[PDB]
Symmetry: C2
Subunit: 220 residues, 2 copies
Amino acid sequence: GAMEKFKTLLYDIPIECMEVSEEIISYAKLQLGKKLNDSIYVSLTDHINFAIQRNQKGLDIKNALLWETKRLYKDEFAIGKEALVMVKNKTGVSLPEDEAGFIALHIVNAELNEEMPNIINITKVMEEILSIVKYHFKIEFNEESLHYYRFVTDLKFFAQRLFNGTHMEDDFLLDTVKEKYHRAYECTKKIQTYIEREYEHKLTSDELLYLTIDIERVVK
Amino acid sequence: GAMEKFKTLLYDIPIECMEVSEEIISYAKLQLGKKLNDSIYVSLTDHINFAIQRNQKGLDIKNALLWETKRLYKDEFAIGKEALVMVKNKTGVSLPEDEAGFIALHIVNAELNEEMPNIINITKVMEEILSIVKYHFKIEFNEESLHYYRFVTDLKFFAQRLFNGTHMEDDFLLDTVKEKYHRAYECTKKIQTYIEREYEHKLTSDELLYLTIDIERVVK
């Protein structure tokens, strides 16, 4: 049919692919405890089928977002890791960890129809800090610059740490930027105080250093 | 059917969803010039359908990997951005940029059956630098630590810059870490020389600073 490709997989689907897809999703539902978009069954059936085909032809894939996925979508990644074990059990094929990341993203997609609290929290703090810098210097960001990319990535790092409750050193590296980049540091202090008072969270010396350099790079 | 969910979408698919899916994929193929897994038609039909449903019920989604996607999958993200325009043209709905990121990842998935040169290059350089640090200190990395996460993220940043040919300041921030973290800096110098000689690429003062701090944090 001319419209078959929009709604169904266009090939003879191996039963084993459907079996492992169901096994993975059953485990995902057990761990997450939330409803998942039924299309996850289609997406994983197809994904595992071609993941195996790639491995069989000697193509070892690489996932550019592997580490960020592991950190930001910890629960989905854990399921993705177990999924690779299930695939090995079913087919005898050992897929690279990179595939656990892609499986994790398929699960995230199936979860998009309900709010994701941790993501909302992290993005909220990022927005708040960006707002402080914009207002302090009365500037608009060049969101295409590599410096802005570094800045926003650092802010996500900070926000993640804040909501993970992870507790951590040496101010020697900060005392130096304080002198040369004093204007940027004035804003760093405002952010430090805001975060400590609003979230009872203390940024580390390293975070304050990165924040100061980031502000200097993006504002100048 | 008991197996329908593994191969087809389980609902009355709006014709408009298939229409915009085809429009987006036609453009993706025009821009990328490569073959795409036919399942991309199913994935995007379903994705846009629920993306619109989310918007209509007041759920504004957030994409935790938005910036990394924009940077690492530039071409796919550009298509994702244009896709949001096509969706607006078809339905009158303006989706958040976050959705452009998810659309980009669906495209990346459809491209996984052929090598992706840029990704291979970036990951190769990351591996080479990690190898230098491991061999220099005769250590094994605690890949679960936040310090390792920062380290590997920085390495990807460096590698991306290297293959993007992006040219950029002040060594004052490096002269300081040279004294306190001298052992780490000895390794920073080896990496700097390796990258300059092997790739004709010069790391910046900022990159050398981050690299030195990263090594100190991960080794100690």
